[PDB]
Amino acid sequence: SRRILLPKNVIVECMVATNASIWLGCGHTDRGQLSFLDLNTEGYTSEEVADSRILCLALVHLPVEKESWIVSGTQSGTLLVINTEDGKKRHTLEKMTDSVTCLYCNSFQKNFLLVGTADGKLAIFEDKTVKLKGAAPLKILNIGNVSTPLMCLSEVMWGGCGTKIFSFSNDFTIQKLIETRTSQLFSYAAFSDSNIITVVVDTALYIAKQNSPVVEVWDKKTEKLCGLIDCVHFLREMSYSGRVKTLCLQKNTALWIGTGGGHILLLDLSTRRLIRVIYNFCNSVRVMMTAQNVMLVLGYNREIQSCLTVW
Amino acid sequence: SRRILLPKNVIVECMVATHASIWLGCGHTDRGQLSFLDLNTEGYTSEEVADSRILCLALVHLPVEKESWIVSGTQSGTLLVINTEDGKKRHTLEKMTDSVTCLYCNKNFLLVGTADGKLAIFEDKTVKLKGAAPLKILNIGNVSTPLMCLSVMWGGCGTKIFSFSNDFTIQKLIETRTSQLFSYAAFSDSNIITVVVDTALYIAKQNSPVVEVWDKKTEKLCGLIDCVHFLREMSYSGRVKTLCLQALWIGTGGGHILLLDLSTRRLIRVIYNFCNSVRVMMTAQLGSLKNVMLVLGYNEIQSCLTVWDI
Ligand SMILES: [Pt+2]
Ligand SMILES: [Pt+2]
Ligand SMILES: [Pt+2]
Ligand SMILES: [Pt+2]
Ligand SMILES: [Pt+2]
Ligand SMILES: [Pt+2]
């Protein structure tokens, strides 16, 4: 477990991993800047590639044809595809009607690129179609509206749009649609009336909402509230906000929770709750993900100093 | 609303009002000290009446025979009955096997809940008799589950809510630990300290900032009220110390008082720093057509009694 310091004032909007290295979208700029970090040598290189800020990233790998493409979704709705080996090979897919707020690589075996936009729409591209300039999506699901950004996808596929949890399968039709804005058992009502920022899929659905310290647990079948995890009370065992910023699952039982501060919780999901707690791991946990085995945690301190801890 | 400052370092464990004046059990002493406060003149008098700390008070009024008796249940299990008019008229009922942790006035009856999970029932008249035995003793819990609140009659014993109407059968028995699935586990695994009954059961647990709301019929959780989150709209503990219906009043471990709506579970009023710690909050009848709200808090200790009209 070592910490790699990014250059000063670098802000990381988004992250994808692949001498291990990671691709980063820069948030300290209004244009689209793509950065590359060698996890071994801690070397950092960047390049302005788009006109608007890069919101999320995805890595589409084609085993046949032996080619890896890095896909950047931008604030203007542009999907910029760049070749990993030869940067001179780059093109653009079909422009989205709003900003690209989610990029996911799914498999059904057929591979797909799911693209969630800020106007509540979900575009689906096929694995091969990513290579084609101006390529059109196979389908576009109108799940929400301009006020309900589609911000997270997890794997059947579950996703978060506004205050709704949606599900879809092979045929790409929305099967389950669960409204999480209202529940009588809510410990506090104002927290639940916020957009869902992350969804992790296990036996139940564990969701977190913007500026909310309460991780909600909903059932797939009954579509009702299974439970509540109040990070404020777990942290107090005192002025912590407990605002959840990221959720990450370990192999089967453990769930990682990054809070608005630099606190990281590790909870068991079978019969008890609390396993491990690390206070002041940073000033603010921003991203937390698993890569191939390996845990990556991107935080920032504030001038701004972004750091990437890995173990 | 007016405040009455009690003498310095006076600690009030229990409280009961009569017509205006109030009776207090003292908690700043290891013996059983009973105090009397005139709400008009703010005069304070006290007397050591028992060997162990007076834990709970009750006021048994007999309209026929025209007699008021003050009953004190203590840490040793003694039930001391004293005449309101003549202090020399005092006696002791049957000793309880553990400390008396609840006294309620409900034909009229006196319910006596003890720390070993038992509930003894006395009739209205039998309080006058020296060494009188209870009509019945219900063994609801054990030595580890104290019966600490009563409000058909509902009550709290350990982590269970019990119900009874005609004094010889425990009707409902609901386990409230089951709420571990919602908003915290350690808070739900605590003894019930207060229960208020309007349409659902609003219960609070020791060292818990979460008021649970349970259904009478389905015997399941209706809702949760997290005082920490309501207070933050920052280091407040939010530990609930008292509940009282009017709307629902909630006194917290701090000096904060919440006033919430029942039908909507919305926030009506919030009074920050009403004192340093709210301890007791109740309604009293200080005379004919006189409904009054009493709040006992404390702030090196200075206990204060705020009083206003409803
Ligand atoms: Pt991302
Ligand atoms: Pt996500
Ligand atoms: Pt993850
Ligand atoms: Pt009492
Ligand atoms: Pt009570
Ligand atoms: Pt009350």
Q: What is the DSSP string of chain B?
A: -EEEEPPTT--EEEEEEE--EEEEEE-SSSSEEEEEEETTT--EEEEEEESS-EEEEEEEEETTTTEEEEEEEETTS-EEEEESS-TT-EEE-PPPSS-EEEEEE---EEEEEETTSEEEEEETGGGGSTTPPPSEEEE-S-TTS-EEEE--EEEEETTEEEEESSSS----EEESGGGGGBS-STTTSS-EEEEEESSSEEEEETT-SEEEEE-TTT-SEEEEEEHHHHHT-------EEEEEE--EEEEESSS-EEEE-TTT--EEEEETTSSSEEEEEEEEE-STT-EEEEEEEE----EEEEEEE-
At residue A128, what are phi and psi to the nearest 5 degrees? -70, -40
Sequence-distant (6+) residues with CB within 8 A of A193 are: A163, A181
Q: Which of B179, B181, B184 to mutate to test the interface with A (most CBs of A within 10 A)?
A: B184
Give the ligand with the smallest distance to the CA of B24. 4
Q: B36 — contact with chain A (CB < 8 Å)?
A: no
Our CA-based measurement puts residue B152 at a distance from the nearest CA of chain A, in whole angstroms, of 26
Sheet holding B21-26: strands in order across? B12-18, B21-26, B32-38, B44-50
Element (H, E) at A231: helix A231-235
Beta bridge partners of B21: B18, B38
DSSP annotation of A85 reads: S
Mode of pairing for the β-strands spanning B267-271 and B277-285: unpaired
CA A92 → CA A67, A73, B114, B231, distances in Å?
A: 17, 10, 77, 50
- Which residue matches tokens 């301009």? A146
Report how far residue A300's alpha carbon sits from residue A4's, in angstroms, rounded to the nearest whole number: 12
Q: A240 — contact with chain B (CB < 8 Å)?
A: no
Are the beta carbons of A284 and A245 closer than 8 angstroms? yes
**Closest by Cα among B72, B41, B32 to B56:** B72
Beta strand extents in A108-221 (DSSP E only) = 111-117, 121-126, 139-142, 150-154, 157-161, 164-168, 174-179, 196-201, 205-209, 214-218
Nearest to A185 among B223, B228, B234 (CB): B223
Left, alpha or beta for B261 (phi > 0: left; psi -120 to 50: alpha)?
beta
What tokens were used for A95?
Answer: 């422009």
Are the beta carbons of B242 and B251 closer than 8 angstroms? yes
Q: Considering only the C-alpha atoms of chain A, give the largest distance between any 2 of them, rounded to a whole number of Å.
A: 56
At residue B231, what are phi and psi to the nearest 5 degrees? -70, -30
Are the beta carbons of A10 and A306 closer than 8 angstroms? yes
Tell me how long chain B is: 310
DSSP annotation of A42 reads: -
Are the beta carbons of B307 and B292 closer than 8 angstroms? yes
Cβ-Cβ contacts under 8 Å, A226 against chain B = 181
Q: Which amino acid is at A161?
A: C
Report how far residue B87's alpha carbon sits from residue B7's, in angstroms, rounded to the nearest whole number: 23
Whether the CA torsion B12, B13, B17, B23 is positive or negative: it is negative
Q: A274 — contact with chain B (CB < 8 Å)?
A: no
Please identify every residue whose CB atom is under 5 Å from ligand 5, which is an ion. Answer: B 149
Report how far residue B233's alpha carbon sits from residue A101's, in angstroms, rounded to the nearest whole number: 30
CA B273 → CA B256, B260, B278, distances in Å?
A: 5, 17, 9
Q: For residue A281, count other CB atoms closer than 10 A to its CB.
A: 19
* Cα B271 off chain centre by: 22
Are the beta carbons of B211 and B204 closer than 8 angstroms? yes
Report how far residue B48's alpha carbon sits from residue B53's, in angstroms, rounded to the nearest whole number: 10
Give the ligand with the smallest distance to the CA of A72. 1
Element (H, E) at A55: strand A54-62
Report how far residue B155's alpha carbon sits from residue B193's, in angstroms, rounded to the nearest whole number: 10
CA B72 to centroid of ligand 3, rounded, Å: 60
The four Cα atoms B226, B309, B59, B192 give a dihedral, to 10 degrees, of 0
Q: A3 — contact with chain B (CB < 8 Å)?
A: no
What tokens were used for B185?
Answer: 């586990």
Nearest to B226 among A187, A234, A273 (CB): A187
Nearest to B183 among A226, A230, A237 (CB): A230
Sequence-distant (6+) residues with CB within 8 A of A21 are: A36, A37, A38, A39, A40
Provide Rg for chain A, Cα atoms: 19
CA B58 → CA A206, A293, B67, distances in Å?
A: 49, 65, 14
With vertex at residue B278, the alpha carbon angle to CA B276 and CA B280, rounded to the nearest 5 degrees, is 150
Interface of B with A in 184-223 (CB under 8 A): 184-187, 210, 221-223
Are the beta carbons of A32 and A16 closer than 8 angstroms? no
**Closest by Cα among B190, B184, B185, B217 to B203:** B190
Report how far residue A43's alpha carbon sits from residue A7's, in angstroms, rounded to the nearest whole number: 10
Q: Which of A212, A229, A233 to mutate to test the interface with B (most CBs of B within 10 A)?
A: A233
A189 contacts B224? CB cut-off 8 A: no
What tokens were used for B192?
Answer: 């019930």
**Closest by Cα among A112, A89, A117 to A170:** A112
Beta bridge partners of A121: A142
A190 contacts B230? CB cut-off 8 A: no
Report how far residue A146's alpha carbon sits from residue B249's, in angstroms, rounded to the nearest whole number: 41
Element (H, E) at A190: helix A189-192
**Closest by Cα among B110, B115, B99 to B147:** B115
* Cα A47 off chain centre by: 23
SS3 breakdown of chain A: % helix, strand, coil, rounded to 5? 5, 55, 40
CA A256 → CA A158, B8, B66, B148, distances in Å?
A: 19, 51, 68, 39
Beta bridge partners of A205: A201, A218
Technique behind this structure?
Answer: X-ray
Beta bridge partners of A3: A309
Q: For residue A92, count other CB atoms closer than 10 A to its CB.
A: 15
Element (H, E) at A189: helix A189-192
Are the beta carbons of B182 and B224 closer than 8 angstroms? yes
**Closest by Cα among B215, B221, B211 to B181:** B221
At residue A233, what are phi and psi to the nearest 5 degrees? -75, -35
3-state secondary structure of A39: coil
CA A265 to centroid of ligand 6, rounded, Å: 40
What tokens were used for B100?
Answer: 């008396």
Report how far residue A10's alpha carbon sits from residue A42's, in angstroms, rounded to the nearest whole number: 14
- Which residue matches tokens 């990070």? A231
Cβ-Cβ contacts under 8 Å, B237 against chain A = 238
